[PDB]
Design a protein around this ligand. Structure first.
Ligand SMILES: [Cl-]
Ligand SMILES: [Cl-]
Ligand SMILES: [Cl-]
Ligand SMILES: [Cl-]
Ligand SMILES: [Cl-]
Ligand SMILES: [Cl-]
Ligand SMILES: [Cl-]
Ligand SMILES: [Cl-]
Ligand SMILES: [Cl-]
Ligand SMILES: [Mg+2]
Ligand SMILES: [Mg+2]
Ligand SMILES: [Mg+2]
Ligand SMILES: [Mg+2]
Ligand SMILES: [Mg+2]
Ligand SMILES: [Mg+2]
Ligand SMILES: [Mg+2]
Ligand SMILES: [Mg+2]
Ligand SMILES: [Mg+2]
Ligand SMILES: [Mg+2]
Ligand SMILES: [Mg+2]
Ligand SMILES: [Mg+2]
Ligand SMILES: [Mg+2]
Ligand SMILES: [Mg+2]
Ligand SMILES: [Mg+2]
Ligand SMILES: [Mg+2]
Ligand code: NA
Ligand code: NA
Ligand code: NA
Ligand code: NA
Ligand code: NA
Ligand code: NA
Ligand code: NA
Ligand code: NA
Ligand code: NA
Ligand code: NA
Ligand code: NA
Ligand code: NA
Ligand code: NA
Ligand code: NA
Lengths: 49, 144, 150, 144
RNA sequence: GCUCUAAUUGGAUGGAAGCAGGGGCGAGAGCUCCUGUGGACCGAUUAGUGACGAAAAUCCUGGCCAUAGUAGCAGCGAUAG
RNA sequence: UCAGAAGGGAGGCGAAAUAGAGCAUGAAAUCAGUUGGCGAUCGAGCGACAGGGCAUACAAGGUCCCUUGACGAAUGACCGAGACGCGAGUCUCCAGUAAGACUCACGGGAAGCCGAUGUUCUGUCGUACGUUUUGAAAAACGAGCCAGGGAGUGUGUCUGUA
């Protein structure tokens, strides 16, 4: 759940801003966002044997 | 009181006639800078070469004046490729044992930057004695 | 802050600095430019006339909308920035005092080096219409002065 | 104007075809020669006077705020004709052009020389005009 | 070319990494040296490992220049010194 | 010194204070001052390649210029003689000769000298980049600038391959 705990929403068009989820005026959750989730992270379920 | 380099700094390799010709050719022909397209137009774009990928890229399309693109036709002659300008082949040296097997006729030695002065002093004396030029010699104070 | 950007001979020179002055950096740049090469005493007399409004300081760089001045020579735009001028007077009073204490003749020493540097901003916000605020900031200025014997 | 130009060549344009002279004067000036064209008013343009005059009148007429400043006088017209045969915006071109001067009459002591191929035979031709005539029609003040 | 693991093997307070400026090699990705700064760590070969390479997404965050000594600090039936 | 528990100067400590307090290192964008080059008659994808000028402590590159000579691919003459053409000119011989890029040798020379680097000038070519598009310099879309961040991953099953 790292980077996913946030109800950040995108405003969509009309503010002259990219459509990126924001909460309290800061980008959140998406992998290109600082504090956003890791897109393809290491995973415990991987078989390393 | 003047600065003088340790070792045989004037030593030159013995090259076959054809190698010396190819060395002279490489030096004469040279090559383009092969800097990345438009690196001079944007500070965030550095000179390090990247193949131009743009469908419309002038350089990719081979438009004269937009710079040559990296291609095998540009490689230096096999015989001379990688030689120091002097014509020596370089051998990288981290210590005294590294000097073993080095032919001071065809090879000069380059002491790694990390190697300290104490070990450098020893490497440089052993190299001179073995007839091997040090490309990056210490400069020491000596009389006029 | 800054350090002295020019080397100076302790025997032939005296030094002074202002730190973090809240005053126009643009005015400071213009003043430095104009007093460099003057005698300490000359600079003092100059700045006092600026404060009185008898002498314009040429604005050669930050000139937008600035009205022309007849006393400006070889240029057009000038102004009378008294605040920064007063601070330069403090800078000169210190420098000349430092100099006197070292046994030089302070007023007669040449200004070898004078330069202003924007060392920061004191930050503020100004409420605007439509529920937004925008920057309302104060420049912070260091200036170095090196006096040198003729 | 009255400045005493020192010319390696003095050309007499009297009864000569303006463009054929200009072409030759252009090439010489680019070749390093300083040139004075003399008796410009008596220089000649072949063809039908009425269409010739319309063309030059159109050039006086055209213009705007940015401006098209076309000379009415015979020396001016000749000068401009030569400028059209020089890369006068490039450095070597502007230099050549400034090495050329055109004169009404002949301010020199010596007669000029007649360039090969430029001379018009008045006994063989009635359809042509003198620059002087064109200028008068254009409204120039006649000082020659 | 990047990370960390392993084996083999090296460098460093007689100055490691990083950084700035500069010299050499490679078609090139990039390698390497010198000087200054820095003041404690750093490689090479082989076999692995992967949160591994950016000029772009009205991309994200932070910093910063021009804009500019510019707009506003007048306007309101309360013009106030 | 100062209105001064500020700040500045001088001084002290320490290997170091450019370790002086949000103080290890201290990039870029960028600012002040200053150096080199250009510069108030002149034209705009900012460059690539070639060539000039001015500038350059050492180090890590050491080449380079001129006369002569040797070698000498393709190509390849003048003049002269003979013949032809109304003429521009051509043919035959001199002759595959002289010449001919690179490379080398003798002699002489350069030390801002050669390379290289900064800037500028001249020549040739040149309307960014990425994307959308049949067609983009586009009056199609995106970005003010820089740094850092930012996109084929795991399990299961199936099918190939080494
Ligand atoms: Cl290859
Ligand atoms: Cl400012
Ligand atoms: Cl100004
Ligand atoms: Cl006009
Ligand atoms: Cl032109
Ligand atoms: Cl006729
Ligand atoms: Cl060769
Ligand atoms: Cl020989
Ligand atoms: Cl993939
Ligand atoms: Mg996170
Ligand atoms: Mg290169
Ligand atoms: Mg760049
Ligand atoms: Mg070392
Ligand atoms: Mg060393
Ligand atoms: Mg105004
Ligand atoms: Mg409100
Ligand atoms: Mg090994
Ligand atoms: Mg891309
Ligand atoms: Mg931002
Ligand atoms: Mg404005
Ligand atoms: Mg009233
Ligand atoms: Mg620090
Ligand atoms: Mg001028
Ligand atoms: Mg369409
Ligand atoms: Mg990155
Ligand atoms: Na939360
Ligand atoms: Na697992
Ligand atoms: Na200005
Ligand atoms: Na004036
Ligand atoms: Na005046
Ligand atoms: Na005609
Ligand atoms: Na006109
Ligand atoms: Na935006
Ligand atoms: Na140059
Ligand atoms: Na698109
Ligand atoms: Na495009
Ligand atoms: Na268009
Ligand atoms: Na902005
Ligand atoms: Na990635």
């Amino acid at each position: 759940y790292a980077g996913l705990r946030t109800p950040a929403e995108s405003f969509g068009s009309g503010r002259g801003q990219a459509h990126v989820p924001k909460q309290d005026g800061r980008a959140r959750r998406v992998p290109q966002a600082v504090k956003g989730r890791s897109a393809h992270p290491p995973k415990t379920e991987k078989d390393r044997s | 009181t003047e600065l003088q380099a340790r070792g045989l700094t004037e030593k030159t390799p013995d090259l076959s006639d054809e190698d010396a010709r190819l060395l002279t050719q490489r030096h004469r022909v040279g090559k383009p800078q092969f800097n990345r397209q438009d690196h001079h137009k944007k500070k965030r774009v550095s000179t390090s070469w990247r193949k131009p990928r743009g469908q419309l890229s002038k350089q990719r399309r081979g438009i004269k004046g937009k710079g040559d693109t990296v291609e095998a036709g540009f490689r230096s002659p096999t015989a001379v490729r990688g030689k120091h300008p002097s014509g020596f082949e370089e051998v990288r040296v981290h210590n005294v044992d590294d000097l073993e097997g080095v032919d001071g006729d065809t090879e000069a030695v380059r002491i790694a930057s990390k190697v300290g002065a104490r070990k450098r002093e020893r490497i440089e004396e052993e190299a001179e004695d073995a007839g091997i030029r040090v490309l990056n010699p210490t400069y020491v104070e000596v009389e006029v | 802050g800054i350090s002295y950007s020019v080397e100076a001979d302790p025997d032939t020179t005296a030094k002074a600095m202002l730190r973090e002055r809240q005053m126009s950096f643009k005015h400071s740049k213009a003043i430095a430019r104009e007093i460099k090469g003057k005698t300490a005493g000359e600079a003092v007399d100059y700045l006092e006339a600026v404060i009185e409004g008898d002498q314009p300081v040429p604005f050669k760089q930050h000139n937008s909308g600035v009205g022309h001045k007849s006393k400006v020579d070889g240029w057009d735009a000038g102004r009378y920035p008294e605040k920064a001028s007063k601070a330069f007077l403090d800078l000169l009073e210190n420098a000349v005092g430092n100099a006197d204490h070292q046994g030089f003749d302070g007023e007669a020493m040449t200004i070898k080096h004078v330069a202003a540097h924007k060392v920061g901003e004191q930050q503020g916000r100004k409420p605007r219409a439509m529920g937004r605020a925008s920057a309302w900031n104060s420049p912070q200025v260091d200036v170095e002065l090196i006096l040198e014997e003729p | 104007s009255v400045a005493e130009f020192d010319a390696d060549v003095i050309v007499d344009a009297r009864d000569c075809i303006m463009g054929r002279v200009a072409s030759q004067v252009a090439e010489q000036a680019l070749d390093g020669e300083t040139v004075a064209v003399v008796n410009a008013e008596r220089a000649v343009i072949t063809g039908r006077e009425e269409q010739i005059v319309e063309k030059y009148e159109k050039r006086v007429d055209i213009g705007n705020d940015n401006g098209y400043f076309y000379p009415k006088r015979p020396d001016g017209i000749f000068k401009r004709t030569i400028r059209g045969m020089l890369p006068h915006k490039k450095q070597r071109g502007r230099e050549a052009f400034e090495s050329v001067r055109v004169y009404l009459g002949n301010p020199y002591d010596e007669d000029g020389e007649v360039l090969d191929g430029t001379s018009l035979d008045r006994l063989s031709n009635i359809k042509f005009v003198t620059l002087g005539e064109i200028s008068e029609t254009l409204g120039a003040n006649k000082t020659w």
